[PDB]
Amino acid sequence: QLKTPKNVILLISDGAGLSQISSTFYFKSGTPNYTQFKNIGLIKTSSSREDVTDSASGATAFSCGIKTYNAAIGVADDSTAVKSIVEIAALNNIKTGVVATSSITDATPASFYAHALNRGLEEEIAMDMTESDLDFFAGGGLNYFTKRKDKKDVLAILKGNQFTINTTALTDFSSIASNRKMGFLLADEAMPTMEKGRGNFLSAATDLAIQFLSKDNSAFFIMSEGSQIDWGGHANNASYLISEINDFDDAIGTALAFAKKDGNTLVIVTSDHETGGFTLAAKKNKREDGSEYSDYTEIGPTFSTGGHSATLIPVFAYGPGSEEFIGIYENNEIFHKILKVTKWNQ
Template sequence: MKNLLLLLFLCTSVIGWAQTPLANQKKPKNIILLIGDGMGLSQVSAGFYFNDETSNFERFTNIGLIKTSSSAELVTDSAAGATAFASGVKSYNGAVGVDSDTNSVPTIIELLSKRNYATGVISTSSVVHATPAAFYAHVFRRSMYEAIAENLAKSEVDFIAGGGSQFFDRREDGKDLFEDFRKNNFEIHTESLPDKVSKKKQLILLADNAMPKMIEGRGDFLPESTQLGIDYLSANKQGFFLVVEGSQIDWGGHGNEADYLIGEQLDFDKTIGVALDFAKKNGETLVIVTADHETGGFTLAASENDYNTIKPSFSTGGHSATLIPVFAYGPGASSFNGIYENTEIFHKMMSLLQKK
């Protein structure tokens, strides 16, 4: 009987701990959200088996899973997946910052900018691609790149780094959006990452469209731009929100190219280390790492009967419906444990950033 009572007490305690409301948790001043586009659990695992260094994923102790279906499809695309993160609503595949009826929905960047947070967007794709776009733009179709670029020029984003310069100064409508950025106090870089930046807002576009692949010599653009973005945004006393996308993990999956995918995954892993190092030192920063969906049905199988050799393989050239891991570190990290809808990423972040 005593053992039964003890068991009931322990179960009740665990349930109570798991249901601790976000309002009672320590809250972060800053959030860094890292999105590995197309990154499922096998992609994360590849960073353990094909990495010369210890994977930065081993530094997380708070881990959850998200369900990723869009409003109309069981298997989401990047646009609907990122809109769920950025605005907390389920929408249709292809939707960027709009709901199922194509009505604009406010993004976390727009909401936080009104509260004087500094904000940033970094990507290894074009910055007008679906995932980064969902955090600042509102269009009913993800391929509306020139319209998305105009949305970015009118946004409150303070630090921007990635590719996509052609959508700003070589447009079909003849507009030069770089002039709009200059009028809005931006410093523009199109040749290389600066060693340091001024106090002006930053627009860094280093490719006409996407940045090069890692296996084609991109180098340390993603970890270095992330460090640069953190250095710039952390000067803001109110706090900051930074979203960083490892875009081309997805593209390696679509192409069923294991070397491409693994190179991008290792680059993303290294970038996570930059964010975690800052968070550990800063003490007021929440780091969240997740993905919009898995791409390629990627798996790490034994090679024939050789259980000491891993042979990466794929089951599709598209996306899959597998649950996606969420990793969190810093103030409020425990609220990301469990299994929940992808829209909860937005709601959990906003709850944690409520005024104290």
């Protein structure tokens, strides 16, 4: 008989396997917020058609609770729309939010508010935002709203659906407190990398979402994504990968700090899949004649692929109901477990 969380925060590190997570224990100043977690599980990430998942089916597993085909956005294997956790939350009087460091129309955020046959339909996904139940969002992707191939001004449609939109910068809570809904579109495409000075966007936007969505003692659901960990993996770029997941761990600390103060909030941290075969290998030293040998004293990150991989992925959970997330299970059970512990009407 587990406790029942009022609020849920789901943080997704795109492309972070256990090796990526491990880098925070070696390449971050201070202890990782990961260490606050006790309840840990493992998910199997394959899609309905492919051993190696993409981000679209991976996120749809979490958001909708079904295995589906790579590239699907909130649709089942037969392409029909399926009810998402955000749509359920709305029907249970729960305020909802989505934060991302990619475009807001990218596969991960999109799976939580849109229904599209293919993740590539990003202008369609943007239009879907205007019909969604979301109360808050923050990310990049201004292009998909204001510079579209179909020349439509979707920004105007957003605002005509009760969204207050800021395209300049994240503000503080008091700035937005009296708005019905709030949207931040802070880049034309993806947000800047950490190495290009994105700073504490992910944490700040998550903290802002929490304050905005908990107005009037309301319960809330938030999904925040460390989107660019995946891109570091694809590029086989260690410093990129490392700086992005270090930022994600900061966001974890933000969520957990709120949850510990609040006492009624479940925080779930997981990834959609691993990418790059990132490995914390021994540093390579080079001698005069003999060239290369391994030095176990230090780490030199290596990669083995430019794409995703099918390893099981760690799930971390803190707060009321967090015990439900231990053991080993299919990725789509994340959805069913959130539904189970919150006791929301399906």
